[PDB]
Amino acid sequence: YISSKIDKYKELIKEIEKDAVPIISKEIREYLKFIIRTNKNIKNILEIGTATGYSGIIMSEEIQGRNGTLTTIEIDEDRFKIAQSNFEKSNLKGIEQILGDATEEIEKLNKNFDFIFIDAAKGQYKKFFEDSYKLLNECGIVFVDNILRFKTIVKRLDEFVNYLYENFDFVLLPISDGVGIIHKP
Amino acid sequence: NEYISSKIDKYKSPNLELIKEIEPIISKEIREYLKFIIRTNKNIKNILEIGTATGYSGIIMSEEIQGRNGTLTTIEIDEDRFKIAQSNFEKSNLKGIEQILGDATEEIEKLNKNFDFIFIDAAKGQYKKFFEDSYKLLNECGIVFVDNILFRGYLYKESPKRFKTIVKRLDEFVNYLYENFDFVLLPISDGVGIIHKP
Numbered sequence A: 001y002i003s004s005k006i007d008k009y010k011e012l013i014k015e016i017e018k019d020a021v022p023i024i025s026k027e028i029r030e031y032l033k034f035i036i037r038t039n040k041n042i043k044n045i046l047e048i049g050t051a052t053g054y055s056g057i058i059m060s061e062e063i064q065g066r067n068g069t070l071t072t073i074e075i076d077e078d079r080f081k082i083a084q085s086n087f088e089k090s091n092l093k094g095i096e097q098i099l100g101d102a103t104e105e106i107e108k109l110n111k112n113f114d115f116i117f118i119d120a121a122k123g124q125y126k127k128f129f130e131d132s133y134k135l136l137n138e139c140g141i142v143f144v145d146n147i148l149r150f151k152t153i154v155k156r157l158d159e160f161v162n163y164l165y166e167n168f169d170f171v172l173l174p175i176s177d178g179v180g181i182i183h184k185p
Numbered sequence B: 001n002e003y004i005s006s007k008i009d010k011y012k013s014p015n016l017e018l019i020k021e022i023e024p025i026i027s028k029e030i031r032e033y034l035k036f037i038i039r040t041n042k043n044i045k046n047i048l049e050i051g052t053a054t055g056y057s058g059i060i061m062s063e064e065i066q067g068r069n070g071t072l073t074t075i076e077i078d079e080d081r082f083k084i085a086q087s088n089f090e091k092s093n094l095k096g097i098e099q100i101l102g103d104a105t106e107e108i109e110k111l112n113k114n115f116d117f118i119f120i121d122a123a124k125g126q127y128k129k130f131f132e133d134s135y136k137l138l139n140e141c142g143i144v145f146v147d148n149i150l151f152r153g154y155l156y157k158e159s160p161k162r163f164k165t166i167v168k169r170l171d172e173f174v175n176y177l178y179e180n181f182d183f184v185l186l187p188i189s190d191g192v193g194i195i196h197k198p
Helices: A002-008 A012-019 A026-037 A054-063 A077-090 A102-108 A125-133 A150-165 B002-011 B018-022 B028-040 B056-063 B079-092 B104-110 B127-135 B160-180
Strands: A044-048 A069-074 A095-099 A113-119 A136-145 A169-173 A179-183 B046-050 B071-076 B097-101 B115-121 B138-147 B182-186 B192-196
Touching: A002 A026, A002 B160, A002 B182, A012 A054, A012 A077, A026 A054, A026 A113, A026 A136, A026 B182, A026 B192, A044 A054, A044 A102, A044 A125, A054 A069, A054 A077, A054 A113, A069 A077, A069 A102, A077 A095, A102 A125, A113 A125, A125 A136, A125 A150, A150 A169, A150 A179, A150 B002, A169 B028, A179 B028, B002 B028, B018 B056, B018 B079, B028 B056, B028 B115, B028 B138, B046 B056, B046 B104, B046 B127, B056 B071, B056 B079, B056 B115, B071 B079, B071 B104, B079 B097, B104 B127, B115 B127, B127 B138, B127 B160, B160 B182, B160 B192
Parallel strands: A044 A069, A044 A113, A069 A095, A113 A136, B046 B071, B046 B115, B071 B097, B115 B138
Antiparallel strands: A136 A179, A169 A179, B138 B192, B182 B192
């Protein structure tokens, strides 16, 4: 029902889709855009795992007005070059791409952010959360996607949800495959 | 999801105890989300609530604004629901609570007050009148929360023509917010519409 509405109401974006690699939901994308558009205080964004740059682009589009900057790190060199040629095509301003290891790069970033996108389906989410949460201004948001071999990935994911609830201002949302929002007081 | 609900039990049990004692009311998923939005926006100071009922949602949201000396205006049309709500607010000791007894189709436009946050239940009323009259009292950057926006729990057999009338209005209201407002649709519980005002 909701995707019918988003397609109904909510172009290079359309074609990064078809070539894709997994990308964010229509539902996540639209909520992402909402959160960022409606808090003019989100000026500086960190994204862990550029992938194809689809998520980086739809986040950066929203912050163009307030001259926001998007800092995004990606390990894979192929996905980097692809994301980099999409960022160029989008003509968006303020995008800082890094090709490296986020596990080492986050702490060596020596600046702060208002908003952090971590994808839990993808790599070392807790190490990124713990590293990057220190880099988050007051009143800042970490958005954690896909938060809700298999049986051991599900154990660690359940342990991460409990760990946030025990230590952070945290909501669990049943959007798409799970959205975990943490707010920093 | 029972999973989320199960996590709310372990970690987000209410600080007020009267709340657990009052627990049709909002989902526990809806309660924590509501609670979360209000807490993380220090600019949410005055709340408009259209549909007091037993006063459970009112306590829920008002508990998040005691720190700010925030207020809560809340309208209810049914005398009996009103008196229950008024008993519960008293037991709550929460400050800032203003109850209005009357019809929100008339009462909303009469308020000389401004609001940062409006709660409206699309499952119960003239929700579009409520939305258009109340949105005018909404400060810039304010939020309208429309609960039960994806609701489809209505007696179908008793009158299918009435069921299809109700749902068609809802659907045309979703379309209306999309075409005209900063709107987001969220599949939480029975459906949540959030409208931001610039």
